[PDB]
Symmetry: T
Subunit: 165 residues, 12 copies
Amino acid sequence: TEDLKKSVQALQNTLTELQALQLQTKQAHWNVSGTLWYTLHELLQDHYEGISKFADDVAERQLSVGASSDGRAITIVAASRLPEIPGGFLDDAQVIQFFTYQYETVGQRIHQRVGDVEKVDPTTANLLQEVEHIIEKYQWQMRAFLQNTPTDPNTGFDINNGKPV
Amino acid sequence: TEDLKKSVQALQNTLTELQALQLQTKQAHWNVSGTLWYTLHELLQDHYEGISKFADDVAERQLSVGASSDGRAITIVAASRLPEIPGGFLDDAQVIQFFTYQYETVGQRIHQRVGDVEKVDPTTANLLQEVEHIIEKYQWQMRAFLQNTPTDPNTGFDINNGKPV
Amino acid sequence: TEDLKKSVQALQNTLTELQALQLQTKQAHWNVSGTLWYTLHELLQDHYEGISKFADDVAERQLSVGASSDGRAITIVAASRLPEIPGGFLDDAQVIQFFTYQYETVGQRIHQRVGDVEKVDPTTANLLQEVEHIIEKYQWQMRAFLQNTPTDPNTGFDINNGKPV
Amino acid sequence: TEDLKKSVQALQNTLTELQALQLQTKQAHWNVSGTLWYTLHELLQDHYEGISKFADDVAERQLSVGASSDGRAITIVAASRLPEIPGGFLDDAQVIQFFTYQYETVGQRIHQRVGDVEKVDPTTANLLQEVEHIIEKYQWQMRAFLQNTPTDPNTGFDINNGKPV
Amino acid sequence: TEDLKKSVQALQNTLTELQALQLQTKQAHWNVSGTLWYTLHELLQDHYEGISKFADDVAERQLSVGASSDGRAITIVAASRLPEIPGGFLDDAQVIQFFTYQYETVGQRIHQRVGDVEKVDPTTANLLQEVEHIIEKYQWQMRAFLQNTPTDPNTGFDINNGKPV
Amino acid sequence: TEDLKKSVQALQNTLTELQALQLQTKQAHWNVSGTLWYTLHELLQDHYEGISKFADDVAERQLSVGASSDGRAITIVAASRLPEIPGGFLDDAQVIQFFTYQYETVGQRIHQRVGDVEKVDPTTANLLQEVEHIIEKYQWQMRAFLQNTPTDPNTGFDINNGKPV
Amino acid sequence: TEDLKKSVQALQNTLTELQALQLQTKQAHWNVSGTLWYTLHELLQDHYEGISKFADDVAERQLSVGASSDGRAITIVAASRLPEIPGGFLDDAQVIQFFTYQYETVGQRIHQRVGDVEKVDPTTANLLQEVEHIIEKYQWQMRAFLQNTPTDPNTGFDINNGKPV
Amino acid sequence: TEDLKKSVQALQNTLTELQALQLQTKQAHWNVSGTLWYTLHELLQDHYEGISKFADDVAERQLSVGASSDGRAITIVAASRLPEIPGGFLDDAQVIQFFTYQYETVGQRIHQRVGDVEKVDPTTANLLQEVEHIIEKYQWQMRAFLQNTPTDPNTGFDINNGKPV
Amino acid sequence: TEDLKKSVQALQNTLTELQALQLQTKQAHWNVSGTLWYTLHELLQDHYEGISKFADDVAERQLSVGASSDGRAITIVAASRLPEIPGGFLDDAQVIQFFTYQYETVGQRIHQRVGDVEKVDPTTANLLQEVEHIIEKYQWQMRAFLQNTPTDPNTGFDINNGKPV
Amino acid sequence: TEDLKKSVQALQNTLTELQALQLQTKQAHWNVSGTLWYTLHELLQDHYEGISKFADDVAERQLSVGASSDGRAITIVAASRLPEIPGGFLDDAQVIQFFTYQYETVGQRIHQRVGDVEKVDPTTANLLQEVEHIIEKYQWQMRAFLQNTPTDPNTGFDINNGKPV
Amino acid sequence: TEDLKKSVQALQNTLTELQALQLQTKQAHWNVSGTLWYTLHELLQDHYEGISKFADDVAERQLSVGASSDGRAITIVAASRLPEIPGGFLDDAQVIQFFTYQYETVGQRIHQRVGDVEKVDPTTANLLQEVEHIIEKYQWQMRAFLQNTPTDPNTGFDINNGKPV
Amino acid sequence: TEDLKKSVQALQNTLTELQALQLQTKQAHWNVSGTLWYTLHELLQDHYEGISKFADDVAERQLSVGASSDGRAITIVAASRLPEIPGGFLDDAQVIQFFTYQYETVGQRIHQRVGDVEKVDPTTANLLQEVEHIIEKYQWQMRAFLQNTPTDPNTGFDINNGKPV
Ligand SMILES: [Ca+2]
Ligand SMILES: [Ca+2]
Ligand SMILES: [Ca+2]
Ligand SMILES: [Ca+2]
Ligand SMILES: [Ca+2]
Ligand SMILES: [Ca+2]
Ligand SMILES: [Ca+2]
Ligand SMILES: [Ca+2]
Ligand SMILES: [Ca+2]
Ligand SMILES: [Ca+2]
Ligand SMILES: [Ca+2]
Ligand SMILES: [Ca+2]
Ligand SMILES: [Ca+2]
Ligand SMILES: [Ca+2]
Ligand SMILES: [Ca+2]
Ligand SMILES: [Ca+2]
Ligand SMILES: [Ca+2]
Ligand SMILES: [Ca+2]
Ligand SMILES: [Ca+2]
Ligand SMILES: [Ca+2]
Ligand SMILES: [Ca+2]
Ligand SMILES: [Ca+2]
Ligand SMILES: [Ca+2]
Ligand SMILES: [Ca+2]
Ligand SMILES: [Fe+3]
Ligand SMILES: [Fe+3]
Ligand SMILES: [Fe+3]
Ligand SMILES: [Fe+3]
Ligand SMILES: [Fe+3]
Ligand SMILES: [Fe+3]
Ligand SMILES: [Fe+3]
Ligand SMILES: [Fe+3]
Ligand SMILES: [Fe+3]
Ligand SMILES: [Fe+3]
Ligand SMILES: [Fe+3]
Ligand SMILES: [Fe+3]
Ligand SMILES: [Fe+3]
Ligand SMILES: [Fe+3]
Ligand SMILES: [Fe+3]
Ligand SMILES: [Fe+3]
Ligand SMILES: [Fe+3]
Ligand SMILES: [Fe+3]
Ligand SMILES: [Fe+3]
Ligand SMILES: [Fe+3]
Ligand SMILES: [Fe+3]
Ligand SMILES: [Fe+3]
Ligand SMILES: [Fe+3]
Ligand SMILES: [Fe+3]
Ligand SMILES: [Fe+3]
Ligand SMILES: [Fe+3]
Ligand SMILES: [Fe+3]
Ligand SMILES: [Fe+3]
Ligand SMILES: [Fe+3]
Ligand SMILES: [Fe+3]
Ligand SMILES: [Fe+3]
Ligand SMILES: [Fe+3]
């Protein structure tokens, strides 16, 4: 009977993480500030759209394997497992640092769910692989702002008041 | 100095209410069940899209009058003022009853914010009028399922196991 | 000289009937109530669009055969030949019953106009056949809500307060 | 209790006037004749589309504030308050004169409804302002054919058989 | 064996007439002059597109009933049966007069072909009815510039140097 | 040599099942009757389109691994393994019951084919997982009409003449 | 009472023939081989789309005149009246030969149904004429690959291993 | 008589300010230089499009209330009331500073015009509120590049040669 | 060093002339009056769009050859070389006369710039040829309203109060 | 005065050649037969569209330099200078041979017109270069069917009854 | 540490193979000759687009797992492992033979990479499965030109100068 | 005979340079890092698309003048004449510096080819002018990141670790 239970756990846990990212990307989209604010405003809206699409796919896969989906605000708050994004005006370097970490953590967790369910539910595993793909792409897109190169360490001093990020 | 403060209060309070409706319409979209489940699945997705558009407009009007916007999950939970939507599978008659009440309550509250800010911030008042317009349309769209007519009281007995809703 | 006169009579009579259906479908679209209100709201808007397209085609065919077209409100009222749709909130079962009858009556009348003009004006007859096609499709779409089947008479008791429609 | 009553009166009266304009613009579209017939055929179809959109918005605002909407042909005829458009072939100069007057009269009446309801129903007032905007634009578009200029009074003699319009 | 022969004759004769109209509408589109030049430039391009579509449909119906289609320039010139459009700059009133006559003549000829083939080839008759429909609409669109009305004979004096057309 | 043979068997068996569903969804689309007829008409057309897309993908994957694809009507009839849909007018409750069962059975069979071929042909397994995903979504969409909830068992009595489905 | 019976017979017989062509064109689309395989792959997909559209129109015309439509696989097999398309890889010359014959036979049969029903049901006759039009166009499109010309008999030897087709 | 005069003054003054912004945003779009040049190139083109749309709406509202609109270059130069944008290559930090100030000043002036005309011309007031909305959004979009945050003052030193902006 | 200088002079001079035409076409679009007002309203908006596109292309070609572009309002006023368009309501005949002259003058000037730069900067010459093409097309489109024909001198008396233009 | 005369001669001569190609490509499109009939049907429709676009551009450039354009059928026949395309069914190899020659001849003639007018009318020369570009591309597209390669002379024996083309 | 190393090796090796196919399909697209040149021109452009899409996806998956991507021309040349496509004009039969082999070889190599990485990186394995799917489809599309059938071996003699391919 | 030879040399040399830029822009798109990585990612994709379009146009112009086109990877490597882009992660300042130089060099070389061929092949010269236009625009778009202004030298210190670029 832990067939359905394992699939549900992986889908529901991924759903809540995506919804948390939905609210955080949108929050950063509105409030990000600094040299890169508009670049990140646009980039975060793209991430928001991709995350939102997969949140709907994950929720409906849960209904498809026969379980209701819990997307309520109390459930997002109850099932954090990750830091909250600060309120107020948000600096561009802070947004980059925040999602570099958040996307990496979410991607790692999905990666393990994939292995957990691939035996009993390869079609769910397939969907979670597609979520992992996009979250890891988004992680790269945040990582690349500070990626070291042969000619420049890209410390971020220029977007962080002269101090490395 | 309560110029900005009055506008911010009206915008932020509306923003949180819209985000609460975002999560509730999406929750009902996934989990609604019964004779009208597909009708409501489609209708709730339309509401979700309209609510989501105005949530972004409200948040950016707040940035435009010079204040950050708080769209975090903890803030949605902290600033409820309305019932939560039940978890689990949701009956069509329950969804109709829930949003008939929720949209009416949200619309009434926006209606009062409009009067509060129209003197100091008519452009914000204009945006909140547009939000009120759509929320009240959505209220009608839920109300109409049970609207009494000369030939039929439309008690809802047929979607509520033989009992009036 | 009754060449033009026969064509004009068939086109003008069809034009007025289409315009009457335009106003009735739109009236039902706004005011329909009950379990099927949203289903019928959507369906009636589709009918409205198809009826409106053919009303313009019929009027311009009348101009093309050399006669002015009378689409005035007084002419719609003067040339009824069919019941009026009730005012006020309209029950879903009442809307279905109303258009099941109205579309059947309009279709039968167009069907006879086709035979009347096919000899002297086959191109007008061709247009009226296309109108008959769509009106008869719409009749089916209303009829199907109450169509008897081997497993269920579909009396409509569920959308008509427990009583067969 | 005259809250709803004042809003309903303003919405319903505007709805009937828009529907009257719907039928008149379409009638003029089919039957207009003369040098400017095609120019006006195209222009009147644009007006028809804008008027039709606002007729639906007005009717659904009426449902949104809790009242049924009366869009029946008998109601258009009963609630005239304006001249009827002539039947038969219509001269271009006659169409221009007719709508120059009709749009001005309708716009003035909406303008007063706006003031009547802005206190109790600013969101309805907002919609009626948008209707007033388009009707007054359309009035200009008809007025401009005969607008006096420094170099030419534009009497219309050229579209009215040598006589000023 | 005169089954195919009757269909071919009707299709080929219609094809050549459409191709003649193709070249004449395009010629008038480029060279028309006067007050209505731009109105007619646009209108004639619309006619050109509709005529061109039916020319392809007629030619392929001929291939479908098993005969090659002759759309060569020498065949258009050889099979005139109608006046040629003048070269040089063309006055707006001259273009209106020309196509009022040409479309009427072409429409009458198609009308008779329809009756000739409807017994042996109703599907070809159906296509020729659709051609007749559009040609007669185009005739109206040219006729309407000079259509007499109760208030104005619309003699065309204003587009023809003070003289009735 | 049973590499190709195992892949072919899984692809061909899935192809025939999809084609059977193609014809059954289309049959139900035309003939469904009752309160939910239009809801199901629309929903079944969506299913038809998704099933049709995957039928083409499955057939071309079979050609891609080097085998011809058998999509003939005799093969659909020969390779049933599932009930036939009744002829005649079909009740809405009967359609829901029929596809709830059919989609579940087809999904289970695809699920096992996935495991059978994932070792020798993971790319075919990947395609069959995508088919399983959509069939299981469609199963949910039919299941949800009768899904039990805390407030309502949703027996279907209202769409099945007073009797539970 | 043989009014409905004659229309039903013509519509149902045409429906089954179209559905048979649906499956055969799709089968040929997947499996066709040789020099012209890709040309025919594309062409057959176009035919498939046109045939599929008319199959839906025919089925819904049957519902519109008040009869259920039988589109089940057993009915396609039971009501053959035409050869089956071979299974396995299909040569380009074989596909051309097959549909040249099949489309001609189907077109001839529809042609007679048109005459049978035109008196009692001209609107159905109109639809069947449109089906005949497209089937006869498709016949030409297959015929043209082997059409004799003054300079070349087009025997097909080049697509049929040196032997005339 | 100062009804029209007050509306005209508010519309014309807004029109000239929008046209001045049109030319300045386009000038900055072409000539902006530095780290943010491409970000601002894109952003300024978006502003240009929104400003251009409202310039046309304002001018046509002026025609709609019965007055000609003055959009000539001499009038833009004559009615400055704001600094001119420098010629030559423009630094990104200079563009941000320039429009942060310009949009704030224009927004404040429109805000007062709204109050001036809302009594006599609420529909004009409504349009000017929509202009104020977009100008204030654009002000935020320029302001955000230098917005102070808890972790970073965003002095702009990085886009202004090491010196705070 | 007069390589860049010759290209810059030709590009900048063309840019200013296009921007002057931008403002003049838009001014005429809003204020044109008389029989042809709507025809010219539409035509002038098309010209405005084409002129605006080439203004951006010319400005960016200037940046591409390494020089900043001066599109400021003071520069348009300073670099007139052509008459200003009158303010106030503008008669249709006056607009036609104005742009007939203005487009001819601008086209002639561009024509000479092309020859000046074709040796040192053929790619700039290529762009200026494309500008010349469109300006000369627009000149024709204004010229054609008064173009003499064999049957009618088209004096414009009908759009100019009985007097030749 | 031979400025205009040289431009007119080059434009008019090109216009007539394009119109001749219009009719010939369309004739070949309908009547082409053989193995490549459908390939050429599609390709010739693409050529037809490109040729038709440039025919309109050439004619309007003629109006733009101040001369009427002669696109009449008699002028196409009078100004041949090239062979006529045969009537009747046309073999694929014959169509390829025909346009290989025709496009080469037309391209060579345009090429010389370009040099003739480039001094006095570089903008016309620019347009004729664009026509030459497309005609020479089309020549390649016909040439390539018989282009010799290291491994195959591509004699065309397979599309020409065993004989080299 | 060979986690990343195994994924990188599989992604980079696939990337280089796709880029090699990009250049080869484009080369064949331009230079292919013979009876099938246009068929292959079109087909190869479709392959080019699909290959190009997956090349970008593979490169960005490499960035997503934390490694730079090497898409330089020297790397394509250095990492051949497959024959080069001949220069000069290319015969249709040669292109078919070339890609039949090349796509098969590339597909086999991707197939093995999938198994190599599926344990440590199932999301990368998922992407490589999608690449394998399209490459194997393209292989079929080239294979089908010479696929043996019961009625015809399809030796290719007709596209290869009388000799089997 | 050096007619074709001069055109071929100019086209082929331009083709190879464009293909080299294709691979370099795509390489920079994937691997660029630092503050401007996303700005350049987007900008480089736009350049890639424009370069790719002109590469196809240049190759097909070569086929149109009768010569095969060499777009093979070995030819790109053999015909360098320009530096290679570094492998590995690429800093934003390095990408800007690289393409500022590369686009300038390519543009200068095309500029000379234009003069070389304009006499014998003005249509090829026309195409190469269009390539020069876009390459020089792209050069500006890279140059502008470091363009000196009156208020800021834009040394790039902020994107290059504190050191001028
Ligand atoms: Ca770093
Ligand atoms: Ca910062
Ligand atoms: Ca009730
Ligand atoms: Ca229920
Ligand atoms: Ca019943
Ligand atoms: Ca009811
Ligand atoms: Ca006047
Ligand atoms: Ca008149
Ligand atoms: Ca008259
Ligand atoms: Ca005239
Ligand atoms: Ca149940
Ligand atoms: Ca039922
Ligand atoms: Ca033959
Ligand atoms: Ca063969
Ligand atoms: Ca700051
Ligand atoms: Ca700077
Ligand atoms: Ca004149
Ligand atoms: Ca005038
Ligand atoms: Ca050869
Ligand atoms: Ca042949
Ligand atoms: Ca073979
Ligand atoms: Ca060959
Ligand atoms: Ca610098
Ligand atoms: Ca850097
Ligand atoms: Fe959903
Ligand atoms: Fe999988
Ligand atoms: Fe936003
Ligand atoms: Fe307001
Ligand atoms: Fe508003
Ligand atoms: Fe508004
Ligand atoms: Fe119309
Ligand atoms: Fe007919
Ligand atoms: Fe018909
Ligand atoms: Fe028809
Ligand atoms: Fe509506
Ligand atoms: Fe308001
Ligand atoms: Fe065609
Ligand atoms: Fe018929
Ligand atoms: Fe397919
Ligand atoms: Fe997989
Ligand atoms: Fe259907
Ligand atoms: Fe008929
Ligand atoms: Fe405008
Ligand atoms: Fe307002
Ligand atoms: Fe630009
Ligand atoms: Fe040039
Ligand atoms: Fe044109
Ligand atoms: Fe040139
Ligand atoms: Fe050019
Ligand atoms: Fe060009
Ligand atoms: Fe990319
Ligand atoms: Fe997988
Ligand atoms: Fe997958
Ligand atoms: Fe997938
Ligand atoms: Fe290409
Ligand atoms: Fe040139």
